[PDB]
């Protein structure tokens, strides 16, 4: 009933579908090789299917689904671990997906190479971020920002800056922190200070 389920999933509804205004529909299923909802790659309409996924542990696996085990959702996927050698991993995909459709072969190869390139780039950016020591932190929340704005306005109003600057300047002049014959002030007015 592959055609029937494809019709139901494409013409009526799909819980894994994310249709965009940019002319392409995306498939949210975690086992879809391509990120587009289409007949060639639908994990639900294609009973016999293959996928490439990366484990958290850095290990890459290829998953197989067949119509004899179309049921048993706990057992749908066969997991075969790929080698860290790119060429040998592609070869192993070749044998283990021999007699499979050319489209699925092509997209499995593409997803393998894309995951390994993403791993390379993640390690590079991790090294780069380490060597720079910079981290992206969130900005101040709007309520906190309002708080410091209001308290700053009140603090300045109570601070009365230039009055205090003159305060300390005259205090130092009176205490004679500018020394004898100050170059700050006129000798006239100085005698007034005396």
């Amino acid at each position: 009933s592959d055609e029937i389920v494809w019709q139901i999933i494409n013409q009526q509804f799909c819980a894994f579908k994310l249709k965009t205004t940019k002319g392409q529909n995306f498939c949210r299923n975690e086992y879809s090789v391509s990120g587009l909802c289409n007949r060639q790659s639908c994990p639900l309409a294609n009973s016999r299917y293959a996928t490439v996924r990366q484990s958290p542990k850095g290990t890459i696996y290829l998953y197989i689904k067949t119509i004899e085990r179309s049921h048993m959702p706990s057992k749908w996927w066969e997991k075969i671990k790929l080698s860290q050698n790119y060429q040998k991993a592609l070869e192993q995909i070749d044998q283990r997906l021999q007699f499979f459709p050319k489209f699925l072969i092509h997209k499995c190869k593409q997803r393998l190479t894309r995951l390994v390139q993403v791993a390379i780039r993640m390690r590079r950016i991790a090294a780069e971020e380490a060597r720079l020591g910079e981290k992206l932190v969130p900005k101040m929340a709007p309520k906190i920002k309002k708080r410091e704005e209001a308290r700053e306005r009140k603090a300045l109003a109570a601070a009365k800056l230039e009055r205090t600057i003159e305060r300390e300047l005259l205090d130092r002049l009176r205490q004679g922190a500018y020394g004898d014959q100050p170059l700050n002030c006129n000798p006239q007015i100085w005698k007034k200070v005396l």
Partner: protein
């Protein structure tokens, strides 16, 4: 959706699963389409039981004036229908390819 038999399984699972959020309970003799296809979408997850299955048989034969419909298509696999030995033998030679080259 939990399906049971009131004649053999009884009516205690009704309350037992009534309390649990999300899960519903429906008798085998009064199957509800609103629960079978929520929101018009097909594929409701139903936890069945053996008595429920043996009574689906009985009720679906017992419904008077209704028979299990005969479908207009026997082999649902259109891939089977097209990519079969008899069809591929009876077909004529192709007149082109999927992607045609530009002539001029």
């Amino acid at each position: 959706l939990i399906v049971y038999s009131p004649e053999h399984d009884g009516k205690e699972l009704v309350k037992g699963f009534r309390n649990i959020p999300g899960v519903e309970t429906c008798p085998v003799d009064a199957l509800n389409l609103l629960q079978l296809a929520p929101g018009g979408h097909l594929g409701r997850f139903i936890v069945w039981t053996s008595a429920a299955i043996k009574q689906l048989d009985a009720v679906y034969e017992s419904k008077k004036g209704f028979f299990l419909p005969a479908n207009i298509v026997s082999q649902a696999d259109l891939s089977r229908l097209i990519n079969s030995t008899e069809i591929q033998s009876v077909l004529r030679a192709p007149k082109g390819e999927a992607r045609t080259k530009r002539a001029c």
